[PDB]
Design a protein around this ligand. Structure first.
Ligand code: ZN
Ligand code: ZN
Ligand code: ZN
Lengths: 322, 179, 89, 11, 257, 59, 169, 186, 312, 34
């Protein structure tokens, strides 16, 4: 290894409750004012970021909402669910203006392209599908994977689409041609999560064996972030270099991206009346500053984490230990 | 050597045929027989490319991942050059290039539901005395009142997947019978 | 120095950087048809813009008289095609 | 717009 | 569906006039061999010809290296059955509907990785130079243009051509229906099975005279003739030396000018 | 994976190497190609003897 | 007493990704062509070049720094005249001959034969033969190529030095 | 298998090729596809099947074992060496290197088997038992000077401050068994 | 990275917007812009630099513009066409300053006097050279030759009119004598364009015989006036009036070609220096930028190509 | 009775996936049919 950059501890500071089913998705508005959250109660809840107050609950999915993205360039929120629907919510009317139909089974994730008017969506049907945001046309179907596609993330340069699957592969896609120009086989188990580093040309992906870092655009393997032996199903990368990987058992490890050193291991507590089997984390997001981590939980709460303001290197030391 | 003649493959030694000896020289099997299987080959790193099998049937795509040293860990706290994000010029150039590339799909998808050609034929017996033809290609007028011409309710198996990417795992971790 | 054949040429090479002939022997096995420069299965298709009037004139001369002016670029000495005896007479 | 020169056929 | 700028055709189908008018019709026909709709091209190869049009699609042309109308091979101008014989290309191409539709899809995928200028692997990469020579030495060199004349006028066969000299169709004897050349099928001619004209070629090519060594295995002598008279027309002993030491070690060369 | 060690160690214990043919082959092939490293281009295809192909078939 | 080392060395040795090769240079048949090849080798001109052409049972060609087949030069300036002399012929495989874009246009590009080719005689200048490594040249002729006879996986040359004999190193 | 039983080997091949499009990570299909070729004496087909299997799933020992064994039974033992060499290039588990050692020992190639150990300890040297097994091997072949040096290098490797009892006991019992009793006591 | 030779936005620029065969194209002598026209009758102006935006488009001809030249001060564009008319277009106004309505057939070529009073030489299918003075409706000179004249230029002193045509011989008319003082004989077929060297010592003349011949037009020449012959280009069955032009340093010459290639020859050696591809039809007109090493080429393909060349 | 709604699988090899190219020449194998 090499020298970790030091990162402050994160502490729990808010617990919003009000979903009646598992909170499956979270995303933060570009201006950082509010975050949406879908859940297994088939309702999308919009919450104020600074005060936690529930602005609005948007209802309209037939079953569990489990992808939610706020468009960086449009006044739109996109969401998909186990009912195979993908929906565009016009936030200037709080109404579903568009549907994207073609998925054959549950929509697992969706990602909204940072500079095109393009939306990509995963499903259990082992496809990622690319949508024209305007005309709802299915500009591509990425029929590469052989088991359900669990995550997708978009970026402006090639590979514009990266996809993770339960076949334990990650694939890099040519979005112009619509063909996978790389397959990263290194995971032993289902790859449920992806994150792209917001300021390095590098991305990460999680599976119960290992989180792996990858240099883009070729996707060559950098290093494992080893030892988080749980069904990891979220990855969030901070702007400063923290990465965090919440897991199905409700544990919540934070890592230095640069060294891979796991500096903190939170274990989440189920909120009252929930069973110890409900500790799990189903999604996480950073706020746009990168100083509030929002996590979505199997206990139907939304928990929020904040850097400990008073920590300093000499309070929480890192040595060298290669 | 001009007094000498080879005749057996061993007579040349390790060298090739002799141009000063005007006899038909076959320093190995070369030229004795007559002219499905790719040939094993050294790479530019001097290793032997047994994993050339993994490259058959691909469009020269990036999945050359077939060596252990591409599965071993690489630099930690990387050298800040390749790892830097692409610049604004790159994201702009990529956006426009990809935009117009998929515009051609969607416009041709929502529409789904003089000019000449100079031709240089290879069959040079040809048009009379001419290395080249030149032809006016008109477009035949479609009748707007004519319905779709052909059945397309056909269904056929998917194209087979692109050949297997090598599996590239960490070695197995031994299960005890306790596990 | 030289610039190989490419989908499009950006940088305007000199004559000697484009048209310098390929050195060395040539395949005994491939026929001249098979060695020929090509783009489709049977030849080099490329778009063209003729004058519509003169193009029509040359068709009808070949059809009706048996000869026409040669359509090739770089036609060299072969100025007429078809029944060249009538063209000269 | 900028562009480039397509190489034609030759004798 | 498949589309292109220009059809895969041989020069006898295009005619001697190097200036042509041609019509393009996207998806305008189904391919005679695979029913897939394909961009059709239609042209008249010179005056007195009929309007010809492309019959195969380009994948079926590429998967046999054949002209899209006449379906002769594009290299030698021979029928497929002759060429597939000499190159030992078996009847490998699937023929049943769903089976060969699947095959053609993979061909089109495979050729789409190439440069577009090659047929399928079997024929793009066949190297039997002796077989190439056998084909070259039997392919017709001149373009036969008579195969673009109009059809024979059935009303003239009925003896009642009511158009007279305005009739574009031919007023002449049909081919006798007992001759097997009158009874041809596009599928037979494409896949190269039971093709009448192929068998008439193969038989006459097999009937050509050939060298063959004698039973005298002790003989290693070749007579050489047509050397011309003595003098400046005669070949030198060096000429035979340079041409024939290519093949093997001459023990002796005797010149008889 | 452990049963194909139990098979393979059993099968290779039950295998008698013809060490006299080994030496004859070593002299014919030569030292360099007879002890090939991972990435030395072995030439000399070795298509088996029919006795060996039968021996493999029985195995 | 043996002659001192000088530019007219009898053998030149090349090392490649596929193999090490040694050539015997025919100074008494083509002195200008042999000295051209040696001085280019002495200037490391061939270092980093590739075999851009391979035709099975015919020819292996290399020695163009551009790898296009059109480039290359010579110590005399650019093109120079052939040294045709019919005491040498392309009598078999492993003949080394000087590749040219037609008569009197020799340059740095050289080709090695893989077959008896006695209709190329007089159109190219023979100037050596393979002295060692015909197994490598036999392997070179097995390398699969595209339809332009260019190897799909490159063979790269990166050594040039003269030697008094075919001994490998 | 059924197409093989009817003698339709070309059909049987295509069926296995179509099976591999469905699951290319199934070791059973690659082995059954391989075994049917070598049942049919299709040794060059079988070699191509194994080269693909070991290319695609390099960590599955069953392909390397079955392939190198086939190439050994068929008496192409320099082919078998290169398979083991290519295996060792993946730095495989300890059990892989043992089969390469055992391969060389069955041909009485002691100096070859020695070289595998000296590479084996560069990879799996951390396991003291690999280090003791080497010195037992050098001892059992009578290279007692190498066996002694092997134990002395073991002590050096694991560090003469972080001293390892298992080396000391094994080394001491070795010198005892070589009658170097004053060294054993030492 | 790669070498650059000009302020062009890219080493080659493709200018698109014409609707017909571009017969003619010229740079402004100040180097700021270029003007192009042909069968589509509109005259398109393009900046040489930046986006090369089509900043203006003059209209007014009722026929194809066969030839088009700037006046030397760049304040006016002369143009002539199949509407039997020469027109002078004011640059600052964009307007027809004069319309010499006096030819009786198609005007094939035009050339303004280099200096002094502005005179416009023109050659026509009526067989006449005419010199028009801006100040008078009537022409100053009418030189009736017997056969259709396709190309014209003044000499540099603007006191001889040089013309060629169907008779293949170039006439040189001396404007104080009103006689042909000498003729230049050597082309095998009809002349398609004549252009005058910057120094005025030499002219080139393109012909359907597929040669360019360089002629010495100086007052005294000690012998034969034929300086040399260039070859390589080709004229096809379209029989376009393929133009020709001089490099501003005179080291290089160009001519239009029907073979799609933009040909440059070196004046001293007569070797082809450039044979650039990229057009898809007859390259009808070619010109050099007056201050910077940039090539203009105008095709029958409705495309204009601008690009750098190494003028070494 | 005639059947035509499907390929007869015994007529020709169905959906034949051809064996890839490999370093060992497959045609050296001679198999005798059972
Ligand atoms: Zn078809
Ligand atoms: Zn045809
Ligand atoms: Zn009739």
């Amino acid at each position: 290894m090499m020298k970790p950059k030091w990162h402050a501890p994160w502490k729990l500071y808010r617990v919003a409750s009000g979903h009646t089913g598992w909170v499956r998705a979270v995303d933060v508005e570009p201006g950082n004012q509010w975050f949406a959250s879908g859940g297994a109660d088939r309702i999308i809840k919009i919450w104020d970021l600074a005060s936690g107050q529930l602005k609005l609950s948007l209802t309209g999915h037939i079953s569990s909402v489990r992808a939610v993205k706020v468009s960086p360039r449009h006044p739109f929120l996109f969401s998909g669910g186990e009912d195979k629907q993908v929906k565009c919510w016009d936030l200037e009317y709080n109404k579903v203006i568009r549907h994207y139909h073609g998925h054959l089974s549950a929509v697992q994730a969706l990602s909204v392209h940072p500079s095109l008017d393009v939306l990509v969506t995963c499903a259990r049907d082992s496809t990622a599908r690319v949508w024209d945001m305007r005309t709802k046309a299915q500009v591509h179907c990425f029929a590469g994977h052989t088991n359900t596609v669990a995550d997708v993330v978009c970026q402006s340069v090639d590979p514009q689409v990266i996809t993770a699957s339960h076949d334990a592969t990650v694939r890099l896609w040519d979005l112009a041609a619509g063909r996978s120009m790389c397959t990263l086989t290194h995971h032993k188990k289902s790859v449920r999560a992806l994150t792209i580093h917001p300021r390095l040309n590098m991305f990460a992906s999680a599976s119960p064996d290992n989180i792996k870092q990858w240099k883009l655009p070729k996707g060559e393997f950098m290093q494992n972030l080893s030892g988080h032996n749980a069904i990891i199903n979220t990855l969030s990368s901070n702007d400063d270099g923290v990465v965090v990987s919440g897991a199905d058992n409700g544990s919540l490890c934070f890592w230095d991206w640069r060294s891979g050193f796991c500096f903190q291991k939170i274990q989440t507590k189920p909120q009252p009346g929930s069973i110890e089997s409900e500790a799990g984390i189903y999604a996480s997001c950073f706020d746009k500053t990168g100083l509030r981590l929002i996590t979505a939980e199997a206990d139907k709460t939304i928990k929020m984490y904040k850097e400990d303001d008073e920590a300093t290197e000499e309070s929480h030391p890192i040595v060298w230990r290669p | 050597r001009t007094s000498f003649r080879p005749r057996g493959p061993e007579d040349f030694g390790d060298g090739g045929a002799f141009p000063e000896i005007h006899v038909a020289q076959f320093p190995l099997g070369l030229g004795l027989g007559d002219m499905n299987t790719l040939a094993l080959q050294y790479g530019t790193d001097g290793k032997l490319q047994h994993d050339a099998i993994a490259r058959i049937g691909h469009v020269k795509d990036k999945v050359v991942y077939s060596k252990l040293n591409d599965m071993k860990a690489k630099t930690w706290n990387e050298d800040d050059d390749d790892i830097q994000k692409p610049d604004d010029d790159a994201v702009i150039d990529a956006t426009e290039k990809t935009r117009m590339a998929l515009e051609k799909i969607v416009n041709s998808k929502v529409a789904s539901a003089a000019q000449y050609i100079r031709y240089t034929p290879s069959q040079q017996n040809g048009a009379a005395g001419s290395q080249q033809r030149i032809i006016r290609m008109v477009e035949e007028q479609k009748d707007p009142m004519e319905p779709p011409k052909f059945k397309i309710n056909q269904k056929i198996p998917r194209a087979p997947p692109s050949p297997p990417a090598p599996v590239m795992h960490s070695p197995p971790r031994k299960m005890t019978a306790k596990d | 120095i030289v610039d190989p054949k490419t989908k499009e040429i950006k940088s305007n090479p000199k004559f000697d950087q484009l048209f310098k002939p390929e050195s060395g022997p040539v395949n005994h096995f491939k026929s001249e048809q098979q060695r020929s420069q090509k783009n489709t299965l049977t030849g080099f298709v490329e778009p063209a813009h003729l004058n519509e009037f003169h193009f029509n004139r040359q068709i009808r001369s070949f059809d009706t008289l048996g000869y026409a002016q040669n359509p090739t670029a770089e036609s060299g000495t072969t100025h007429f095609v078809g029944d060249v005896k009538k063209a000269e007479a | 717009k900028p562009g480039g020169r397509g190489m034609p056929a030759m004798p | 569906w498949e589309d292109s700028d220009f059809p895969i055709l041989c020069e006898t189908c295009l005619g001697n006039n190097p200036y042509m008018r041609m019509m393009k019709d996207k998806y305008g026909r189904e391919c005679k061999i695979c029913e897939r709709p394909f961009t059709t091209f239609r042209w008249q190869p010179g005056k007195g010809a009929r309007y010809k049009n492309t019959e195969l699609c380009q994948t079926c042309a590429k998967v046999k290296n054949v002209c899209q109308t006449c379906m002769f091979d594009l290299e030698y101008g021979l029928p497929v059955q002759v060429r597939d014989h000499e190159l030992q290309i078996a009847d490998n191409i699937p023929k049943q509907g769903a089976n060969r539709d699947f095959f053609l899809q993979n061909v089109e995928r495979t050729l789409g990785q190439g440069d577009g200028t090659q047929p399928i692997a079997q024929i793009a990469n066949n190297m039997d130079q002796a077989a190439h020579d056998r084909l070259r030495r039997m392919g017709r060199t001149q373009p036969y243009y008579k195969r673009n004349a109009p059809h024979i006028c059935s009303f003239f066969v009925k003896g009642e051509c009511k158009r007279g000299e305005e009739c574009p169709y031919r007023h002449e004897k049909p081919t006798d229906p007992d001759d097997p050349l009158s009874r041809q099928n596009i599928r037979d001619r494409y896949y190269g099975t039971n093709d009448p004209v192929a068998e008439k070629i193969l038989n006459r090519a097999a009937a050509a005279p050939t060298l063959s060594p004698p039973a005298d295995t002790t003989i290693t002598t070749l007579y050489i003739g047509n050397l011309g008279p003595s003098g400046a027309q005669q070949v030198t002993e060096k000429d035979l030396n340079d041409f024939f030491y290519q093949y093997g070690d001459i023990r002796c060369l005797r010149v008889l000018t | 994976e452990d049963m194909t060690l139990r098979q393979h160690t059993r099968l290779t214990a039950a295998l008698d190497p013809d060490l006299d043919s080994y030496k004859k082959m070593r002299e014919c092939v030569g030292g360099e190609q007879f002890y090939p490293t991972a990435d030395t281009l072995i030439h000399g295809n070795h298509y088996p003897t029919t006795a060996a192909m039968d021996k493999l078939t029985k195995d | 007493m043996p002659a001192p080392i000088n530019d007219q060395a009898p053998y030149v040795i090349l090392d490649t990704t596929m193999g090490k090769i040694a050539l015997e240079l025919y100074w008494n048949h083509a002195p200008r062509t042999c000295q051209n090849f040696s001085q280019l080798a002495k200037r490391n001109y061939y270092n980093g070049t590739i075999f851009h052409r391979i035709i099975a049972d015919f020819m292996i060609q290399g020695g163009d720094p551009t790898g296009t087949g059109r480039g290359g030069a010579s110590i005399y300036g650019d093109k120079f005249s052939d040294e045709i002399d019919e005491r040498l012929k392309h009598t078999g495989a492993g003949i080394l001959s000087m590749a040219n874009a037609g008569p009197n246009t020799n340059g740095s590009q050289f080709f090695i034969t893989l077959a008896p080719t006695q209709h190329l005689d007089g159109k190219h200048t023979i100037f050596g033969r393979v002295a060692a490594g015909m197994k490598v040249i036999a392997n070179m002729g097995r390398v699969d190529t595209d339809n332009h006879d260019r190897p799909k996986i490159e063979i790269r040359i990166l050594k040039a030095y003269p030697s008094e004999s075919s001994v490998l190193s | 298998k059924w197409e093989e039983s009817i003698g339709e080997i070309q059909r049987a091949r295509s069926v296995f090729e179509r099976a591999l499009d469905v699951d290319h990570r199934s070791i059973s299909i690659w082995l059954q596809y391989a075994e049917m070729e070598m049942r049919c004496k299709q040794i060059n087909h079988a070699r191509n099947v194994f080269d693909r299997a070991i290319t695609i799933m390099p960590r599955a020992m069953q392909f390397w074992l079955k392939y190198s064994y086939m190439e050994e039974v068929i008496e192409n033992i320099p082919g078998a060496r290169q398979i083991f060499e290519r295996w060792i290039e993946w730095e495989p588990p300890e059990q892989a290197w043992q089969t390469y050692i055992n391969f060389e020992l069955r041909y009485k190639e002691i100096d070859r088997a020695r070289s595998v150990y000296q590479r084996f300890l560069h990879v799996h040297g951390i396991n003291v038992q690999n280090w003791i097994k080497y010195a037992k091997f050098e001892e059992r072949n009578g290279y007692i000077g190498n066996a002694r040096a092997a134990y002395e290098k073991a002590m050096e490797y694991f560090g003469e401050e972080d001293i390892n009892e298992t080396v000391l006991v094994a080394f001491a019992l070795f010198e005892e068994r070589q009658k170097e009793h004053e060294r054993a006591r030492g | 990275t790669a070498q650059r030779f000009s302020n062009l936005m890219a080493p080659t620029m493709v200018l698109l917007g014409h609707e017909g065969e571009i017969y003619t194209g010229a740079f402004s002598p100040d180097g700021t812009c270029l003007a192009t026209s042909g069968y589509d009758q509109k005259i398109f102006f393009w900046n040489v630099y930046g986006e090369c935006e089509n900043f203006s488009t003059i209209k007014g001809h009722s026929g194809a513009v066969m030839d088009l030249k700037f006046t030397t001060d760049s304040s006016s564009l002369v143009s002539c066409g199949t509407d039997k008319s020469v027109r002078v277009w004011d640059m600052e106004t964009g307007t027809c300053a004069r319309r010499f309505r006096t030819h009786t057939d198609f005007v094939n070529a035009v050339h303004p006097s280099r200096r002094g009073v502005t005179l416009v030489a023109s050659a026509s299918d009526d067989g006449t050279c005419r010199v028009h003075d801006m100040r008078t409706k009537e022409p100053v000179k009418t030189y009736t030759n017997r056969y259709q004249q396709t190309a014209v230029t003044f000499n540099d002193s603007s006191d001889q009119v040089i013309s060629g045509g169907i008779d293949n011989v170039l006439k040189v008319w001396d404007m104080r004598r009103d006689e042909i003082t000498y003729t230049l004989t050597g082309h095998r077929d009809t002349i398609t364009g004549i252009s005058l060297s910057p120094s005025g010592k030499f002219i080139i003349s393109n012909s359907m015989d597929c040669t360019v011949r360089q002629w010495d037009i100086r007052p005294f020449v000690p012998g034969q006036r034929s300086v040399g012959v260039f070859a390589g280009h080709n004229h096809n069955f379209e029989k376009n009036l393929l133009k020709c032009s001089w490099s501003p340093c005179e080291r290089f010459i160009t001519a239009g070609s029907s073979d799609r290639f933009l040909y440059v020859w070196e004046t001293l050696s007569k070797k082809i220096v450039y044979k650039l591809p990229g057009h898809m039809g007859s390259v009808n007109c070619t010109d050099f930028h007056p201050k910077e090493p940039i090539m203009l080429s105008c095709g029958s393909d409705k495309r204009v190509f601008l690009g750098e060349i190494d003028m070494s | 009775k005639p059947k035509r709604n499907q390929i007869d699988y015994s007529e020709e090899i169905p959906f034949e996936k051809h064996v890839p190219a490999g370093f060992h020449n497959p045609s050296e194998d001679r198999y005798v049919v059972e």
